[PDB]
């Protein structure tokens, strides 16, 4: 058995995300764990819990490379994949890997991808192992990788961000509730730079949220921790997005992590939207990049 | 690291218990997993999930020795302990070991015990391993054992059984509901050979259950599967037992596993009751000895 790649995290790195994972736990359960190698020499490897949200949404519970302690790709650059991924809910078992992985009592978490010496050009298995606080307890999980998929966190690299608005906790819940009220319907999201307003409509139903302008462009907004939670926004263009009410509801929920993050809506020139979890200055330097992509939903 | 004991179960042996465990998982979760070494010259090692039920009850989900494929004790009889135990809910972990151990897809299950070559009469750690159907997935859990405890399935060795009555579904359920209604009070259970009836009182509340006599003593009854389910009993002496209503309710619930078992109440001369899960001929030959001991409880 040969090792294709080795990935190991720093002491207790992933444990600080324990509560964050718990918040997203229910949505991440039926998804998959995925390590993005496609960005190894672009910051480092990126492990992420990836799953669906609603009728047209993709969650990416991603860990910043800052959490990585050692990376090793033993395959020729040309053989290694852009990404490997196994399913979060391990084969047969009752244990959800993401839960154990992002556990708070884990000192060292690490992954090892293997293949059989003979036939097979790409990794075929992964071996997660978590070593706990007690300096005594270990857990090793051997799983089969899945049919290759691109890095979830790769679908927006060529997209153009025309603005993003921070949603104050109450506003977020308010929207999140409205979205839920719309069931399996669609929501037409409207960004109006002129009116400093974001609008959502689903049939006759409707909802309007105002926002204070930031005398700065999209890409220069919310670059660091969110020091204040207020309905603020940096928009530089109009746009209408057709998303699924249910996906929007799940996103707003997941990105508002108690005492940790507040939802930030990122608008793209194409009809696409990405609800991002803006980290509060309080919740320290969590190596988290949580987002949910709202795909185009034909109503 | 020195290996003291090794236990390997037969292929798929513990998987047949999958639904049975699930039926008790809520109770077993906070208990412990434990291997009774005493029963090695009495059929073989006995693994059991052991936990508390109500205010005065001990639950024992024991696996018949005929499920074990290979046992090896590498310690002299002097050093070897009577029983080894470790938390069912693994340390800092999120999965309960028992849930994964009795997984329906576990091809092979095995346990190993170790200790350091210094200070330590008995084993200090255990390593459970699960090999799955897919012939690819494996799980290894390494834990610390707990301060030693006697084999749960031993507390009834000197006790002399004076009677046992089987309860059919509708009957058991009446008793269980009655017990839950008595909330946190105590139940005075009476066995009357002259009136062929068992009575339950908790304050002004009461309940009487008739049973048809078996022309055989206590120890020769319900030896094998129970092809039918009718309120019959092989009693042979009066006895009044003081039990906790909540333990009684839990015990009846646990021993009536849907389409698998029916509760059987075993009364002992000492006024102690043990609720047992009589297996229906319907269920196959499950290697399961589930029971719940109702200890003495005062008003
Ligand atoms: Cl209970
Ligand atoms: Cl010792």
From Swiss-Prot, chains A, B:
Keyword Chaperone: no
Chief localization: virion
Region annotation (Homodimerization) ranges: 1-299
Molecular function terms, GO-annotated: DNA binding
Compartment annotation: Virion tegument; Host nucleus
Modification after translation (UniProt): Phosphorylated by the viral BGLF4 kinase.
GO CC terms in record: host cell nucleus; viral tegument
One annotated GO biological process: symbiont-mediated perturbation of host cell cycle G1/S transition checkpoint
Effect in UniProt of substituting residue 256 to E: Complete loss of DNA binding activity and transactivation of the BDLF3 and BLLF1 promoters
Domain of life: Viruses
Keywords: Activator, Disulfide bond, DNA-binding, Early protein, G1/S host cell cycle checkpoint dysregulation by virus, Host nucleus, Host-virus interaction, Modulation of host cell cycle by virus, Phosphoprotein, Transcription, Transcription regulation, Virion, Virion tegument
Domain notes: The N-terminus is important for dimerization, DNA binding, and DNA polymerase processivity. The C-terminus mediates transcriptional activation.
Family: Belongs to the herpesviridae DNA polymerase accessory subunit family.
Function, as annotated: Acts as a DNA polymerase processivity factor; a transcriptional activator for several EBV promoters and inhibits the host DNA damage response (DDR) to double-stranded DNA breaks. Plays an essential role in the viral lytic DNA replication by acting as a polymerase accessory subunit. Stimulates the viral DNA polymerase activity and appears to function with it as a holoenzyme. Increases the processivity of the viral polymerase, probably by acting as a sliding clamp that prevents dissociation of the polymerase from the active template.
Subunit structure: Homodimer. Two dimers can adopt a tetrameric ring-like structure. Forms a complex with the DNA-binding protein BALF2, the DNA polymerase subunit BALF5, and the alkaline exonuclease BGLF5. Interacts (via N-terminus) with BZLF1 (via bZIP domain); this interaction may inhibit BZLF1-induced transcription of the BMRF1 promoter. Interacts (via C-terminus) with host NuRD complex; this interaction is important for transcriptional activation of EBV promoters and inhibition of the ubiquitination step of DDR signaling.
Protein's name according to its UniProt entry: DNA polymerase processivity factor BMRF1
Originating species: Epstein-Barr virus (strain B95-8)
Shown segment, full-protein numbering: 1 to 299 of 404
């Amino acid at each position: 058995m040969e090792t294709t790649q080795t990935l190991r995290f720093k002491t207790k790195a992933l444990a600080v995300l324990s509560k964050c994972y718990d918040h997203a736990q229910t949505h991440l359960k039926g998804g998959v764990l995925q390590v993005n190698l496609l960005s190894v020499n672009y910051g480092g490897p990126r492990l992420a819990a990836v799953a669906n949200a609603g009728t047209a949404g993709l969650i990416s519970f991603e860990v910043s490379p800052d959490a990585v302690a050692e990376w090793q790709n033993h395959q020729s650059p040309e053989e290694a994949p852009a990404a490997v991924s196994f399913r979060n809910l391990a084969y047969g078992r009752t244990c959800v890997l993401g839960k154990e992985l992002f556990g708070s009592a884990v000192e060292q978490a690490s992954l090892q991808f293997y293949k059989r010496p003979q036939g097979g050009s790409r990794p075929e298995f992964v071996k997660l192992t978590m070593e706990y606080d007690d300096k005594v307890s270990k857990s090793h999980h051997t799983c089969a990788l899945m049919p290759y998929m691109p890095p979830a966190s790769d679908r927006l690299r060529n997209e153009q961000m025309i603005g993003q608005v921070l949603l104050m906790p109450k506003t977020a819940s308010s929207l999140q509730k409205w979205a839920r009220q719309q069931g399996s319907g669609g929501v037409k999201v409207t960004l109006n730079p002129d009116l400093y307003v974001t609008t959502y409509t689903s049939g006759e139903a409707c909802l309007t949220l105002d926002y204070k302008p930031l005398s700065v462009g999209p890409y220069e907004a919310f670059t660091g921790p969110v020091a204040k939670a207020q309905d603020v926004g940096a928009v530089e263009a109009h746009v209408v997005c057709s998303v699924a009410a249910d996906s929007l509801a799940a996103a707003l929920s997941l990105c508002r992590i108690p005492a940790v993050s507040v939802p930030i809506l990122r608008f793209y020139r194409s009809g696409i939207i990405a609800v991002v979890a803006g980290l509060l200055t309080s919740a320290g330097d969590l190596p988290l990049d949580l987002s949910v992509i709202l795909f185009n939903h034909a109503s």
